[PDB]
Structure formats: structure tokens, C-alpha cells
Design an enzyme around this catalytic site. Sequence first.
Site, PDB file in Angstrom:
ATOM      1  N   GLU A  27     -25.684  22.229  -4.501  1.00 55.51           N
ATOM      2  CA  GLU A  27     -23.971  22.186  -4.342  1.00 55.51           C
ATOM      3  C   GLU A  27     -23.539  22.660  -5.712  1.00 55.51           C
ATOM      4  O   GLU A  27     -22.834  23.605  -5.630  1.00 55.51           O
ATOM      5  CB  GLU A  27     -23.559  21.138  -3.750  1.00 55.51           C
ATOM      6  N   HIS A  28     -23.765  21.845  -6.580  1.00 54.99           N
ATOM      7  CA  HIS A  28     -23.365  22.117  -8.110  1.00 54.99           C
ATOM      8  C   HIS A  28     -24.113  23.571  -8.647  1.00 54.99           C
ATOM      9  O   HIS A  28     -23.370  23.788  -9.260  1.00 54.99           O
ATOM     10  CB  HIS A  28     -23.550  20.983  -8.804  1.00 54.99           C
ATOM     11  N   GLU A  31     -21.932  16.678 -15.151  1.00 51.12           N
ATOM     12  CA  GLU A  31     -21.186  16.673 -14.134  1.00 51.12           C
ATOM     13  C   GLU A  31     -21.418  16.138 -12.842  1.00 51.12           C
ATOM     14  O   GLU A  31     -20.738  15.056 -12.493  1.00 51.12           O
ATOM     15  CB  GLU A  31     -20.599  18.246 -13.673  1.00 51.12           C
TER      16      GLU A  31
END
Lengths: 105, 446, 57, 57, 423, 211
Positions: free
Chosen positions: B60-61, B137
Site C-alpha cells: 500500500e505504501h 512512514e
Amino acid sequence: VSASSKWLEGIRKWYYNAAGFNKLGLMRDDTIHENDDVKEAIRRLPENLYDDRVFRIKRALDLSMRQQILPKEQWTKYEEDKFYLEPYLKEVIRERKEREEWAKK
Amino acid sequence: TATYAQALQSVPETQVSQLDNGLRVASEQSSQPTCTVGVWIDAGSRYETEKNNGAGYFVEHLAFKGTKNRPGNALEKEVESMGAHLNAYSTREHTAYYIKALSKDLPKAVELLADIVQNCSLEDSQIEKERDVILQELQENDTSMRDVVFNYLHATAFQGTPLAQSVEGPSENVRKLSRADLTEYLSRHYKAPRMVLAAAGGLEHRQLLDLAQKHFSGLSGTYDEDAVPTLTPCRFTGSEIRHREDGLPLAHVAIAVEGPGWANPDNVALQVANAIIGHYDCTYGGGMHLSSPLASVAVTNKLCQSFQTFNICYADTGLLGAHFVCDHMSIDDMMFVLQGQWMRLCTSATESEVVRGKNLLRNALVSHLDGTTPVCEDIGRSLLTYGRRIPLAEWESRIAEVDARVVREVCSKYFYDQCPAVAGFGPIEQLPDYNRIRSGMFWLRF
Amino acid sequence: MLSVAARSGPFAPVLSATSRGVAGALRPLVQAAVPATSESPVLDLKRSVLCRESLRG
Amino acid sequence: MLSVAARSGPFAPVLSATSRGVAGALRPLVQAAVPATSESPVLDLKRSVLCRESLRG
Amino acid sequence: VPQHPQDLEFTRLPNGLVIASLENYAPASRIGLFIKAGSRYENFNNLGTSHLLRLASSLTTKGASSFKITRGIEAVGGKLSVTSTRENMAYTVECLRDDVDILMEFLLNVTTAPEFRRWEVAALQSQLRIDKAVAFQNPQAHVIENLHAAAYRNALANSLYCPDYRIGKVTPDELHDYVQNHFTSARMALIGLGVSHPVLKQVAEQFLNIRGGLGLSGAKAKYRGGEIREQNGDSLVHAALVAESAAIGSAEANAFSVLQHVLGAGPHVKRGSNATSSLYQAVAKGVHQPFDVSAFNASYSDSGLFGFYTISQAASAGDVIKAAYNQVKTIAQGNLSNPDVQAAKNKLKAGYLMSVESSEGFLDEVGCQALAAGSYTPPSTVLQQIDAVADADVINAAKKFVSGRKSMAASGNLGHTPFIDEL
Amino acid sequence: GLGLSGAKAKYRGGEIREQNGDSLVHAALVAESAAIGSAEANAFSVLQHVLGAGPHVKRGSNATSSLYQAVAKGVHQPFDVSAFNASYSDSGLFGFYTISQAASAGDVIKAAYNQVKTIAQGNLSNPDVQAAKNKLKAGYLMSVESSEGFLDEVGCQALAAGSYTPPSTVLQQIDAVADADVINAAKKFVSGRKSMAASGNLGHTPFIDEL
């Protein structure tokens, strides 16, 4: 509280000269036995009213203990009595008739 | 007019198609001048296996992280300069990626989609850096604590058991992220035959097949090899835990009892049943008149600060039930509410509510059907799970078929004498024992 | 020829009893989601959000 | 040659435990007492004031 | 094929009431009522009575029992909410077309039939405090909304909540008056979606007569520009710095919308550098950490301002906000591309697209038509008017924004932030 | 110890603006003065006396000041205005604390500024100056005074004086009272960015931009 109603509500007038309430100067509405409907009914009562019925009630207790009554003159004015709750109350009668109503539904 | 069912027919017909892979492409061609161009990115939240943990969240990232055919800012150029839309909505077995666009633009992102489909790259720069943006992140990005609430309902009240398995996976894994997870396990996972060719808007399905061949073709052709097991049934956790917090200022409480998932035929009425359930909103007013009797007393008693029927999904099972909020008190009577209401439910059926929540599922029924993306993804999981689409009069058919006998009975069938999910958040002392709370799972009302 | 709406992320409340409240109004402000340590909460003296009802044909 | 004080009716608090608090500080603001209906309160969820200890030889 | 698909019928009641039946053959039911009762028509005589009434649809109704009303509302189980806007309050019912009449009746009731019961009202009071709680609640309801409360400044900031000092003070006098003072055919807009223009006209006729609006747009709502300054102690600072734009319906209004797009706003595709704007691309080149700036539209017919909502940690606020102004200056340089202009028109114009769009954000967008448009200057004509996009006025506009007294808005401590006088 | 006097503590002058709903409005409008120890400091104290403050004898028209006498001639109802001293060594401001019902706030506060303007006219008497020196100088007197307001005043000596420039010398320095700098000062006050302060709703009040 006048002659038909001083005989009949003169159980509350002449015969609450005998049964006491109005000659005791009571509040007609105030005579309703406390019930739930009565309860929240009063919860919705008007304010200045609330004070009024208060002083009435307390006083009633007062002479009651004193086992006296006000001047028969001071004994309450016949007829001539706002039905205090009855708009408010009776409104609630429709209310619990409504909760009661859709309840029936 | 032609009534809600003959409106349902009067509601026009969607269509679907199968491209030659066996490739799946379905079409709702509409007046939408823009459109939700689903390139329905089918990599979901639960689709993954044990040591595979996190690779789909990383993915996803990694999904928009940039690629070759379009570089990152270039993806931002065709895409962003196009001013287009991209999402990744990850679910058990599948997910989606939106594109909002001028239907005029319809080819462009399709092209983009393809490289999305393919050219997504693991770049030892990005894989260092964007994957320092993943390592970072992501790494700290975790901590969402309604996902320690609602995903305490998912990452806790849904267990992490191989079937119960959670989504994000380990922080140890976060260290341990691999190109073998991406170099390999992206490929070693990502498999097109399951990917969804998803058409929402004004559109030409013939053109759909066309561009399909043009770009979208040549996808699932390379697919298969090994490792495609099924779901071996078992028991999800079946427990409770308080993250034990004096620091939790007020309960964010909750509960749930089977929520939809993909499969079972029952959930239809269970839907309706959950309807009878309903979600008692804090922000909602009108409690004096509230419909859910639970909700009512909750008002009168001021008996809780929230409850919301919340349907937790797995093919054929789950938990659908209230979130909640409360002080040192509610929970007890809550179940007395909840389970008792359930008990009440399991017994008390009156057609009235049945019709009500029927109209609920009708209005709502629009509200899914109604809306462009809701209809979009609706198609996506619609074939994903179903492979079919419950037609307006099909869903309105079993819906139409709704039966309150099956309320009493079927209620008993699924519901009775079970141990579904309940999760508060905070100082749970009103949580009784399974020997009490789940003694409450049983009814001495009879 | 009479216009109220759409610029995405400001506030002009929408609320009801049957429903819950919200304001999505004209103008932005929604862009903040980016950083690492993306964290996020629940469990203490709060409200939350997000409900809806949507189904089918 | 070092100066702090006196201009009458502003606030620079003076408080203690043994004592109570107050600020009479430099600058005015005390002039308001004039009007009719000079009223004034007590009896509801409040604080009041004014204590001291003074006696004799 | 529908008999050639029905064109939404725009009209005005001969009485001076906004009479709108948009014929929708669509399967569902969408019922708008746009009310001038939106915050514009609001007055300093009262506070939050719109926050209130916004709650008070549920209130005890004349001729309708909020419990019985609750029985019909609760009965069909449909969507009825009046909408809180600076311009309007909108009575909305989306549901099965059948109950529409009942709904309409309810509607007719809802609009026309307040009882404003003292008892009931008094009860209602607290739920407000609850409401304001929701209002200020969370970085959306707080850093966005309470820092809307800490952002929104003028009588538009006359709150979806009420005032604290005003708390609990509502009067039923202020009710019957307020509507009697506010509610009016002046506020009257009825918009059907899905129904018979004839039937909507039927109930409309036998029902809806009213009148009675009032005066003015504000102090020039007192143009302090400048700070609404808020000490927060926000941890990560929430500061938002306010440029300005233009009035609703202004010739340049659309142009302002351009400049909006120029600096842009949240992306249609998530997870991006915000590569698209000197406010963003040069927040990208400019800024290394969490930040946001964007332009509002506070559109009176009379006036307007497009700020920049901002987000960032304290340390860089002077750095960023200055850079903000700097980029603003940089931007106001007039340097622009053509693909800037056109590809903009793509981006923002698409703004009008999804902005116009679909069954809900139809009813909210094509229901910002089914309420909030008033006609189609079509995506033909309004996107012709949008195609009437012209760049230079964005240059002279860049000057114009550079030219005014605008606002700054503060959530935090300025120890790293600028105070805009020290700007 | 450590460093500095403020932002120039950020000189917004201007409003600290407070919506109150104060019933009877409490608004206070801020002129400015001068720094602690400033040459003109004492002079500021004069101007203070010029507009004066609460009387040593109670129950009076406030007959003594263009802020007061011309609040007397000016104003018919509850009102107050007075000058502070916020005395940094660095800077200072003497406002006017104000008191009045909402309706006249534009009326009064404007009149305030008006009287201020009127005052800044430089019209003054000599007995204004001297009898002032009586009034305010007496200010230093009771201000210096007695066993408690010794310990608080001669204890604003026993703390807060630091020497006696005696009632000899400091009231010599007070006798160093000089009027003209109160005229040029009248300009000076007229000359700055000062503050307004708001308790209420301005529906009758001025916002000082609309001033």
C-alpha cells in the site's frame, strides 16, 4: 365551589367545609393523589405557580399541625378558582394518552 | 411509479463481461461525465499469510511509490497533472483503487492502470528511501488506536489467528521488510487473475474490451504456480482483554455479533437483523423517542455514551454490533441490554420493526446503490465475493422474501447460545466474566 | 441560479438526530495525513464518527 | 532607588495561605460605586473577602 | 429510455417563493428546502439559535408531537435533516417516494409547525452543550473545526455552535420571534427531486405561504483582516494564515477559484508530494515537514476572502508562514505557464465536475443543484463560463491578494511563529 | 538572572477584544504613558492626575477632570476612565479603564477620545497644574504613608523605594513638575498606537477601527 358544587364540589366546598379542602383554602388541583403522571405532571408545572402551590401546601401543613383553620372569611373564595394544572395536567393526560397511544399502536 | 421493485427494474441494468484471460471486466455505463474509474486494486487487508505479514500494507505504501514507465513525480504528472484520483481500500481478500476522471480521459489512466498493474517498481533508492519512507512512514505510522478499538475489534476482538489474522503484521517484520517480500512476495503474491477490471461511469464496454486488449490485456497470463490454500475453519480468539488503562479517560466501548463477510446466505436477514439491532449514535438525538428500545432506556437511564451496531466481516461469519462509550457503569446492563435485547430479539419479534428495518435496508439500499463509488466498489466486491450481482430485484427479492418466522428461528439458528465479540476500551471492570458476561451469553429469562 | 456549496474540507455544519453531525463545507484543510508515526487514537472521553446506512437493490 | 508600587486599584496579586489573596496594584479602576439600585449580593457559589486582624496596645 | 429525460423544472412561486420542482425520474426520493435562514440572515439579537434549531427540528411541534413526529420520522425511517449553512438551512428528505407526502406533511409540519415548548426547550438546552462538544471535538472538530472556531472569524463564524456567554439563555420568545423574525418566504426555497412538479405544487399551494426577511451583509464584517489570534499550546502547532479572494457571484469569483486551483488543495489521488503548487510544489521545494495552506471562499454576495488554512509544527512557522508569504510574493510574480492555466482548468474544472456529481453528492452536489445551483449554466454553460477562464486577471489578481488587508489566524504560541506585524 | 523586556511586548496596541455579555457593559479603553524611571514618567503621573482617578472624598460628581468633569458634563451615567502605568524600565502605557452600560459606549468612548482630543487641545489652567501637584503629589504622600501602607508604601519604601529622594527631593523632583511636556505629551498620547479592551458586545460599542 358553588351550590351544586357547594353541595358536591361542596363535598369540597360546603362539605369540604366538612371535608375541609377548600374551606381549608386548599388548591383543587393540589388534591390529586400523587401519581407518576401526577409526578412528572408537576415536574412540568409553571414556576410562579410552583411557588404558589408551595405556599399553599406548607400553610396547609401549618394550620394542620395547629389543627386550626384560616378565617372562614380567609376560607377560600368559592368558585373563582383557576384550574391550575388542568390545562397543563390534562395536556399530560393527552401525553400519557399519547405515549399510551402509539403505545397502543 | 413502477414500484420500488419495478423501479428496481426501472433502475437501469448494469452489465458485466469476461475478458479473455478469463479476465473479468464489468461495466456500468452511465451519464457520469466524470467517473470512478476503478482499477480495482484487489490486494486487501486479510489476503495475506503469516510470514507474509505487512507486505500488503507495505505494498500500500508502495502502491503509489513511483515506477518506471511513469516515474514518481511523473505518475504525479500524467496522474496529478491530470488531476486524477487514486485510492487503495484494502479488505479481507481484495481491495480497490479509484480513478476519478473525465470520461473523456477514460483511456489515459487505464494506460496508467496498466503500469500500475505492472510497472510498480521496488527501487533500491525508494526501497532505501521511499522505503525509508516505508521503514519510517510505516514504521511508526502504525499506531491508530481506534484501530486499537474498531481494530481492537479487528486487531484484537478480531484475533490474529491464521484465519483471524490481523492486517499490518509485525514491527519486527517492519525491520524485516524484504524485496523478497516485494521483489519476491509482491510477485510471489500479486496475481492478476484475481484482479478486478472495474467499470463505473459513462463508458463503452466494447471500448472496455478494446482498451483491455490495448493495455489491460496481458495480465493474468502469467499467474498460478503454487500456494493457493483455502480457509480451514477454526475458532477466532473468543476472549477479552482490557488494555488496562487508568489512562483511558472514558470507555470507548463496543461489542459485535456476526458481521457480514463474503459468503453466507443467512446474513440477508441478519442484515435486517442487524437492522433491528441498529447503531445508537451519541451525536444522535431523540432518545426519548428512540427506536432501539435499548437506545431508549439508554436515554432514560442516560445509560451509555454510545453504541453502534458494527458488522465485522469474514466469509460466512463475523461480528456486527455496537461500539459504545460509558463511564464506570454501563457495560453490565448494556449486555442486559445487548444480549438481553438479543434475547429480546431471539424471542420478541414483531413484524413492525421487521418492516421498519426493511425500509432501512431499502433507503440504505439506495445509499449503497445510490452513489458512484459506492456502486463502484459495490460491483468490485459484488463479483469478487459473489461473482454475480444481486440484482435490484434479486437483492430486493430475498429482501422481498424477508420472513420474520426466520427471524425467530433463524435468529435462534445463528444467534442463540454463542460467544461473539465484545470490546470496550478502558477500565472494563463492568466487564463481567465469561463466567458471568458469557454466563450472560445464556438466558435465564428462560 | 442560487448556489450554496462545494469547496471541500471547510465547515458549514450538517447535523440531525436520526443522523449525526458534520461540516464538510466549501474550502480545504483536509491535507494533514502524511507523516510517519501515523499513530491515531481511541478509548478516552471522546466522540468519534463515520456512520452511514447503505445496502443494495 | 528601586521602586515597585502604588497607583491604586489595579492588580498585582498579593496572596498567602495564612492570609487570603488580593491585588490593589498601581493604576485605578475602583470608581464604579455610584448608581441607584445599589443592590449588591451574597448566597450563591462564590468567595467574598475582606478579613484582617487588628487590635490594640 | 425515459420520455425524453426530464429537464429539472426551475421556477419561482408567483408569490415570491422559490418554487423548484426538479423532475427526477430516478428511483429514490430527494427533498430539499433551501432557507435564507442560513447564517447570513442571522442577527446579534440571538446566539446559536441556529445551532439550536439545527438541533431543534426534533423539538415539540405545533400540531405535531415530537414524539409522534418521531413516530412518523422514525416510522418510514428516511433522511430528514435541515442543513446548516451560512446561506441556507435546508430541510432534506431522501426516502421511498411513497411516504413523501407524509414526509411532505412532516416537511410541511417540520417547516411550518413549531410549538417551541418551554419545557421541551429547556430540556433541549443541554444537548447543545453536547453539540458544541462535538463541534470543537477532534483535530477535525478541533484543529479543523474548533480551529475553524479558531479559524472562522466573522458572522460566518457565528457558530454552528452557540456562544458560551450565551449558554443556556435561549428564549421561546426568541423562537417564535426568531423564525417570525427570520423564517419567511424570503427564506423560502422548495426543491423537489423525484416527484411531481404538479404534486409538489399541490402541497406547495395548499400549504406554504410565508414572507418577511431583513437587511445586510455585515460590518464589512468588520474588516479587521488580521489575526484571530489564539494561544493554543497545540503540541504540533495549528496555525492558519488567511489570504483573501472575492465575493460570491463576483465576475472574478471564478478567477478566484482559479487561484485556488493555482495553489490547489488536497489531491484527488492520495499520498503525494503536493507537487502541484507554488503553495505546494514550493511548499514541496519549500517545506520539509507537515504543512498545509489553502484558500477559502467566504462568499457573500457582497464580499469574499480565500485564506490559506495552514498546518505545521511550531519551529518553522516563521520559516514556513514567511516562506508562505514569500511564495505568495514569489507567486504574485506573475510567473505562470499556459499548461498551468489549462491543466488547472482540468483540475479545478473537474472540481466543478465531481463537485456537481452523484446521487448523494448529487443531493449534496447535484443537490447542491437540487438545492444549491439554481439552473444549469450547464457543464456546457458553466464550464463555458468556466472555459471563460482567463489568466491575466489571476496576475492582476496576484497583485490584488497582495494588495489587501487579510487575516492571520493563530493556534499555538508564536515563539517560533510570526505575528504578521513583525511579518 | 536573565535577559529582556518583551517583544516590545508585541505592540499590538489595539484591542484585547472580549465578547462578554456583561449585562452592564465593562469596556476599558487604553491610552498609553511612559516607561518606569523615564524622564517624563513623573509627567505621565501628572497627566494621570490631569484626568485624575478615584477621589479621596467619596460621593462626588468626579468634578475634577476633562476625563471626569467632562465625563461629568459629558456623561450622564455609570462610567470610568483612568490611566494605568505599565512601567517597564523599557516602556509604558497608561490606558483608561472604563465602565459604562452598552448603549453609550460608542457615545462615551468616542466622547472619551473626543475629550481626549479636547484635552489634547493643550487648554489647561495654572491652578490645574498646581492644584494637581497638590492632588497627585498628595498621591505620593498617602502613597508613601503608614505602618501597613508603610510596609506596603513606606514598605513600598521598605521594599519599593530604594532611597528617599525625600518628600523633599522626590517631591522636589515632584516639584520639578512642568506643564508643557504635558501638552506635547497630550500630543504624544494622541500620537501612538495604544490599546482598546473589550468586555461586552460592541453593538453599541466602537471597534476602534470604526473609531
